[PDB]
Structure formats: C-alpha cells, structure tokens
Ligand binder design. Structure first.
Ligand SMILES: COc1cc(Br)cc2cc(C(=O)O)oc12
Length: 274
C-alpha cells in the first residue's frame, strides 16, 4: 500500500471534481489518472458492500466496474487524513469531448451518431449496475483517440438509481431538465434522457442549446447548423417538456437517426486519423 506504487506526472485538470494527475502504475507502466478529492467537499458518503465510510463516488465506481470499457474503471483508491485518492484508468492518447468539440466545431452526423450510441451504451450500463450518473455532458466524456471508444467519467454527482423522485441535484445546471429548474424534482431516467438531448444538440450544433433557466423552462429548440430532420426530431423528443413524453433508451436506440452506426475502430479510422 501507499504511492511508491505509482509515479505521479503532470496535472490533467482541476475544478468541482478536484484535481486529477497523469500517472503510471510502477509495476507494469499502466497509464492511470490519479484523482484527489477533499473530504470537506464531499456531501455524499456511502458504505462499502463490506463495511467502512467512503465517498458515494467510490461506491458508484465499484458498482460500475467490469470488462466493459464504455465507463471508466476504478483501479484502486486510498484514504488520507484530509482527502481520498482514486486511481482510475487512463486511455492514451485521449481527449475529452469538450476539447474535441472546441477544436473541430459541430460534428458531422455520422461521427455524432457513433459517439452518441456509445454514450447510450455507457449510460445503459450504469443503469443496469443501479447507478445514476447525473452529470452526463461533453466534459465528462473521454475519447480514446486510437480505438475510437468513449468512456463516461466523473461519478462525483451520481446517486444510486431509484424509481422514486429525486429532490437533490449537484450536476450541471444547463444540462438539467425543466422539472428540476421549476420544482426541484425529477426522476432519474427521464432527467438522464433530457441531458442526453442537450448532449446530442451540443455534438451536432457545436454548443449547448440553452444557457438560462428561461430557455430551459421553455424548451423551444433553435438549430444553428444544418442538421437533418431525423436528428432534429430525436433531439426535440429527448427534450420534451413533460418527462413522460421523453423516449426510453430503447426508443432512442430504435430511432431512424440511430441506424447503421459505425464501429469504434471504423470511427477512428475515418474521423480521428488512425
Ligand atoms: C482530466 O481528468 C481525467 C482524466 C482522465 Br485521463 C481520466 C479521468 C477520470 C476522471 C473522473 O472520474 O473524474 O477524471 C479524469
């Protein structure tokens, strides 16, 4: 135990999630990302399937770990007197969807379809494991540039998935649905589908559709780029004002705009340069 186990490199980012460094696991040079979270900044704690007090983040990552690579894996974690330290996987090379979209502007539909599908798979995977992510957005998605695979990251606002109403939220306001804004109430699935609608708008227009509580409440969608009618229809569907009018994941993945998706390897060859 302790970090002669890892070799710390450059800082990768910091913000509401804490501080994430690039790292290398010494015993086999596996790339890793080392995430430090302050105890003071952790409102949400859980208990391991076997005993102790840990941040909910850790509970949730334990629940979503598997061979499936569409969600980031937690490799290990350590406690410290004032902080927790998570060791997570790190694809290489890599770039977040926010930078990628900042670089290339609005994405061609074929590449947005392939990215959005993989997100849909990642999110289904998390619902399956009893975990609701609650902060789906471009900044919380990583692209493994070689294989063309996306990884959902940053479970720091997640909660156990439940079928009753949520009355707390600490994800990202511009991705939160109308019923959270007006009532401070949402159900998990349907709030997830709305954030997915924001996400898809973002990929295909190059920016999020709504900046202010006003526009969220009203949910009128203006498209600023050429975007096909089938893609516009899917987006307006995810963004139905009434939660019960939103599509299920099955209905999203059966949408005509979602047919004939590229494989990740295909996606990198054609769109990322392999
Ligand atoms: C820049 O931040 C990051 C870089 C890499 Br590479 C992997 C992760 C995972 C998380 C997370 O779970 O928050 O943040 C990351």
């Amino acid at each position: 135990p302790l970090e002669s186990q890892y070799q710390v490199g450059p800082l990768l980012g910091s913000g509401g999630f804490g501080s994430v460094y690039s790292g290398i696991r010494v015993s086999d040079n596996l790339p890793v990302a080392i995430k430090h979270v302050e105890k003071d900044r952790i409102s949400d704690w859980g208990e391991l399937p076997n005993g102790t007090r840990v941040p909910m983040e850790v509970v949730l990552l334990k629940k979503v770990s598997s061979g499936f690579s569409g969600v980031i894996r937690l490799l290990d974690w350590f406690e410290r007197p004032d902080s927790f330290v998570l060791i997570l996987e790190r694809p290489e090379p890599v770039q977040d969807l926010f930078d990628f979209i900042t670089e290339r502007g609005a994405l061609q539909e074929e590449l947005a379809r392939s990215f959005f599908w993989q997100v849909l798979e990642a999110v289904r995977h998390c619902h399956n494991c009893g975990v609701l992510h609650r902060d789906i957005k471009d900044e919380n998605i990583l692209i493994d540039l070689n294989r063309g695979e996306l990884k959902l990251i940053d479970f720091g606002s997640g909660a156990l998935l439940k079928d009753t109403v949520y009355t707390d939220f600490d994800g990202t306001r511009v991705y939160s649905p109308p019923e959270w804004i007006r009532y401070h109430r949402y159900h998990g699935r349907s709030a997830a589908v709305w954030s997915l609608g924001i996400l898809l708008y973002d990929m295909v227009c190059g920016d999020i559709p709504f900046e202010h509580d006003e526009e969220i409440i009203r949910g009128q969608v203006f498209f600023r780029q050429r975007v096909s009618s089938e893609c516009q229809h899917l987006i307006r569907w995810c963004l139905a004002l009434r939660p019960s009018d939103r599509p299920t994941f099955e209905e999203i993945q059966n949408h005509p705009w979602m047919q004939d998706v590229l494989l990740p390897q295909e996606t990198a060859e054609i769109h990322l340069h392999s």
